[PDB]
Amino acid sequence: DFRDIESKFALRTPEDTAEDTCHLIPGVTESVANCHFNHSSKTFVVIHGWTVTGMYESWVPKLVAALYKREPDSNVIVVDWLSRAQQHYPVSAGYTKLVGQDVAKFMNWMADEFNYPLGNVHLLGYSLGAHAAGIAGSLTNKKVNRITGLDPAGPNFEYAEAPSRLSPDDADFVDVLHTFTRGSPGRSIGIQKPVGHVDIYPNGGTFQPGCDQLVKCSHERSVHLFIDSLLNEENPSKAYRCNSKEAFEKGLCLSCRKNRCNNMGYEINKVRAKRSSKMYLKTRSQMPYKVFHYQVKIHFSGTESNTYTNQAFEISLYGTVAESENIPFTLPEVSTNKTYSFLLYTEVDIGELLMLKLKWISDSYFSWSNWWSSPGFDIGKIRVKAGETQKKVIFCSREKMSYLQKGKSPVIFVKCH
Amino acid sequence: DFRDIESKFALRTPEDTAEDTCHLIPGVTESVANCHFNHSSKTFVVIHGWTVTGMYESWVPKLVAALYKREPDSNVIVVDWLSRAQQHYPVSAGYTKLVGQDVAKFMNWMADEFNYPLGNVHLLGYSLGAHAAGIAGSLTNKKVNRITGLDPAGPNFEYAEAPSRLSPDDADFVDVLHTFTRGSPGRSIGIQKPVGHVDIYPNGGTFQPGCDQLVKCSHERSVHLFIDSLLNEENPSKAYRCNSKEAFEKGLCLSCRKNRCNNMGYEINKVRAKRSSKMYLKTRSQMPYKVFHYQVKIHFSGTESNTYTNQAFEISLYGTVAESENIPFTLPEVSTNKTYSFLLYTEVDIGELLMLKLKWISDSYFSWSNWWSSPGFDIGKIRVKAGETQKKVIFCSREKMSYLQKGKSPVIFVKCH
Incomplete structure (x- = not known):
């Protein structure tokens, strides 16, 4: 046998x-x-x-x-x-x-x-x-x-x-x-x-x-x-x-x-x-194949009811150990009085989050584009839930600069509670 | 530990x-x-x-x-x-x-x-x-x-x-x-x-x-x-x-x-x-420690009722491969119309038994001892049961020389059936 x-x-x-x-x-x-x-x-x-x-x-x-x-x-x-x-x-x-x-x-x-x-x-x-x-x-x-x-x-x-x-x-x-x-x-x-x-x-x-x-x-x-x-x-x-x-x-x-x-x-x-x-x-294209996973929930609020689509955002991550600066993401069907969520990843270790910018960039490049007053919103809070370490932090701003507007200066959020 | x-x-x-x-x-x-x-x-x-x-x-x-x-x-x-x-x-x-x-x-x-x-x-x-x-x-x-x-x-x-x-x-x-x-x-x-x-x-x-x-x-x-x-x-x-x-x-x-x-x-x-x-x-005093075991049953018969004691016998073993000649054993309380059994061992391989002598020796040595007519018996059968190979043979004699007597010629038994 x-x-x-x-x-x-x-x-x-x-x-x-x-x-x-x-x-x-x-x-x-x-x-x-x-x-x-x-x-x-x-x-x-x-x-x-x-x-x-x-x-x-x-x-x-x-x-x-x-x-x-x-x-x-x-x-x-x-x-x-x-x-x-x-x-x-x-x-x-x-x-x-x-x-x-x-x-x-x-x-x-x-x-x-x-x-x-x-x-x-x-x-x-x-x-x-x-x-x-x-x-x-x-x-x-x-x-x-x-x-x-x-x-x-x-x-x-x-x-x-x-x-x-x-x-x-x-x-x-x-x-x-x-x-x-x-x-x-x-x-x-x-x-x-x-x-x-x-x-x-x-x-x-x-x-x-x-x-x-x-x-x-x-x-x-x-x-x-x-x-x-x-x-x-x-x-x-x-x-x-x-x-x-x-x-x-x-x-x-x-x-x-x-x-x-x-x-x-x-x-x-x-x-x-x-x-x-x-x-x-998710993974990365090189020999360390580890990325982190972050959940971001954003509350939109305002007065002028105007829907849009395919808007591109840029976000930053500021933490204890290091920082991540220019992570891009997009969101279709943005409108007032909603609550949107997505997934976000990075390859640099952070630790615990402290602050978070939020910039809504402009697709236009012309010198015309400074006029025709841009759309804007009133962002109150962002709920962030980390992937591995199950911490649910809350971010907010002060009672100034709480108005994200396209092609303008970005808002800056801090640890709120 | x-x-x-x-x-x-x-x-x-x-x-x-x-x-x-x-x-x-x-x-x-x-x-x-x-x-x-x-x-x-x-x-x-x-x-x-x-x-x-x-x-x-x-x-x-x-x-x-x-x-x-x-x-x-x-x-x-x-x-x-x-x-x-x-x-x-x-x-x-x-x-x-x-x-x-x-x-x-x-x-x-x-x-x-x-x-x-x-x-x-x-x-x-x-x-x-x-x-x-x-x-x-x-x-x-x-x-x-x-x-x-x-x-x-x-x-x-x-x-x-x-x-x-x-x-x-x-x-x-x-x-x-x-x-x-x-x-x-x-x-x-x-x-x-x-x-x-x-x-x-x-x-x-x-x-x-x-x-x-x-x-x-x-x-x-x-x-x-x-x-x-x-x-x-x-x-x-x-x-x-x-x-x-x-x-x-x-x-x-x-x-x-x-x-x-x-x-x-x-x-x-x-x-x-x-x-x-x-x-x-049982064993033997040297480096091959194997002995065989034989059972011998003897039927005594006769007319003159006379009991004796401590009588010494000598027996032989005649088989196919080899032979054993002068094995000694004793039996106390011999008498007529009985059936006696004992144990017998040897150190020479036999095979299958063919014939068997039986001699009843004399303790006396003097030249006087040929007279005062010796006691004798009439032996009919001997049942032999081997130890390992469970064979139960039967031995008997012819209708002559069937009279064992002390200090005389021994009887000779053959395979009877």
């Missing part, structure tokens, strides 16, 4: 990360003590996804070093694919049902000879690798601990059966990233269906703000968002639970009570749910 | 059996992978008993080689005593309640860090070592598999409590030898009480037929009967269940049905019982 294991195995060291020296063989037991498999710690299994060349991709010799820097004295097993993945795509879409059985036989061998606990096994998966890890685990003697899927495959695995894809019953805790879900239903590269216990949509999941290397740009963010979560142990990147992509832009759903607002990546909290769990956050 | 472990530990190799090079340390985990503890096989723990010098005894560097010859690629852990055993005897009779707790802490550490099964652990014990292994096991997280006690301690551990000695609830299967149980109740070197699931009394347990080296002669037979059982894999030495020492000499209890007639030593069958289980066998 141990000659149909052509999908090989390997074990890599922190001193040698880019090679495949010490192999493991299912059935031969003189090699397990040859690769120095430490029987006390956890075990990472990294399953390779699709490829078109003969070698590995470029993210595996970085993910090996990241795992060996975050969790020292552990086990990272690299599964091999290079006689089965270099094909066309419906050809390699059928080999997952065999490679998952090979991995299941290997794990049952390790759990039935050496009495391995199967309680400290992470199953990392790329686009085909996530479905490989999903078809594994269901064919084990008991439940595996955690399967992490990084932007799984879309085309032939959507509309399929639950024992055929990465289903939420495959393990005890499954988290799935959804970086590249742009396209029609059934014709997308990533999968559009929520499949895990926790389902994170970074930037909504349509694309990523960085787009042959440029061709696969927003398909490698599901690895570069995980390497960053392994490196930044002390600083987690929270993700926020909402109900739709359009509602998160209005900022009505920054609520972190009753099993909401989980983390993203390795430091996620094991929380089970009853249904699909869509979660949201 | 890992600095009160002054009773050290060691692991020995088949290439180095008489030294203590690679130690194990409870708590320090860089040494478990240093001694190459194979996590797949079984584990032997040899607990040393009492001593009076500073070094080990002479049977441990033979038992190590015997275990490594019988079960290759296994684990033999030698427990150390040499700062606690070189004392007086009521001094070393109190340290077992500490060494057993140290061994229990070591086994719980191995079973709670490396997830060891605790299903393949043999606990070998000498005279104090058996009670050390008995006070261990009760203080483990679950039941250990098998504890073997080799002639446990007698004086201060008799009349004690069940959580204080080697009790039958200490493990899942416990076998105990009783080689040196001679003495008064409460004043014996070995223990006189049956304590195990299987309790074997070789030669009844009073002494052994081989009796400073000569002082401890019949206390080392409980190790030399186990080394022989490890070496002779293909040839087991059966032990026979009876009810008293006097009844086994009459041979009325050679019955091997309904969970009777188990083996002796390593090759014993796991059979649980409801009460104490006394079992019997």
Whole structure:
């Protein structure tokens, strides 16, 4: 029963990360003590996804070093694919049902000879690798601990059966990233269906703000968002639970009570749910991928009832540690006696807020534009609710300069209570 | 919790059996992978008993080689005593309640860090070592598999409590030898009480037929009967269940049905019982310790009613492979119209019996003794029941020479049916 294991195995060291020296063989037991498999710690299994060349991709010799820097004295097993993945795509879409059985036989061998606990096994998966890890685990003697899927495959695995894809019953805790879900239903590269216990949509999941290397740009963010979560142990990147992509832009759903607002990546909290769990956050185009989240509610008031549209504002943020000066945002359908809310983000740490400017800029540039007296409003209060630290401050002004007018000097608000 | 472990530990190799090079340390985990503890096989723990010098005894560097010859690629852990055993005897009779707790802490550490099964652990014990292994096991997280006690301690551990000695609830299967149980109740070197699931009394347990080296002669037979059982894999030495020492000499209890007639030593069958289980066998004074067991029933018949006593007989055994010629036995209270039975043993393999002489010798030697016509009887049949191979043959003679007479020619019996 141990000659149909052509999908090989390997074990890599922190001193040698880019090679495949010490192999493991299912059935031969003189090699397990040859690769120095430490029987006390956890075990990472990294399953390779699709490829078109003969070698590995470029993210595996970085993910090996990241795992060996975050969790020292552990086990990272690299599964091999290079006689089965270099094909066309419906050809390699059928080999997952065999490679998952090979991995299941290997794990049952390790759990039935050496009495391995199967309680400290992470199953990392790329686009085909996530479905490989999903078809594994269901064919084990008991439940595996955690399967992490990084932007799984879309085309032939959507509309399929639950024992055929990465289903939420495959393990005890499954988290799935959804970086590249742009396209029609059934014709997308990533999968559009929520499949895990926790389902994170970074930037909504349509694309990523960085787009042959440029061709696969927003398909490698599901690895570069995980390497960053392994490196930044002390600083987690929270993700926020909402109900739709359009509602998160209005900022009505920054609520972190009753099993909401989980983390993203390795430091996620094991929380089970009853249904699909869509979660949201925003990112940045560089190697620190953390941004903060602020909610701003603005009360408009005045006398002259005049509606407008597509007005551009500029706001500042003045706090204890540092400051943010020229954040732009727009609001359509501004009018009197309303209460508007939106979402605001930044990449500079603030601390606790002190003051806040508010400028309503002018689209016109001509020397004509100083006349034809500009529209204005009477702003009383701004409610600000921070994202992580749940503080709800109140801002107001004095009984002077409380009149925002387009193309004029901005108002300045202070801490009001 | 890992600095009160002054009773050290060691692991020995088949290439180095008489030294203590690679130690194990409870708590320090860089040494478990240093001694190459194979996590797949079984584990032997040899607990040393009492001593009076500073070094080990002479049977441990033979038992190590015997275990490594019988079960290759296994684990033999030698427990150390040499700062606690070189004392007086009521001094070393109190340290077992500490060494057993140290061994229990070591086994719980191995079973709670490396997830060891605790299903393949043999606990070998000498005279104090058996009670050390008995006070261990009760203080483990679950039941250990098998504890073997080799002639446990007698004086201060008799009349004690069940959580204080080697009790039958200490493990899942416990076998105990009783080689040196001679003495008064409460004043014996070995223990006189049956304590195990299987309790074997070789030669009844009073002494052994081989009796400073000569002082401890019949206390080392409980190790030399186990080394022989490890070496002779293909040839087991059966032990026979009876009810008293006097009844086994009459041979009325050679019955091997309904969970009777188990083996002796390593090759014993796991059979649980409801009460104490006394079992019997005989041995020989040299390194092959196997003898066969034959039951002989003799029907006396005649006319002249004359009782006698203390008459000596000589019998022969003629079989397929070899022959036994001059086996002596005696029978008191011989008389007409009776049926007598006894036990007979030998050390030469026979096979299947063919013929059997029977000679009733004369105590007198004088030239007078040919006269005063000797007493005689008329022997019809002899029922022979072999020990291992349950065959019940019937022997008889022809209708000539059927008259055994003292100091005359012997009768010769053949296979009768």
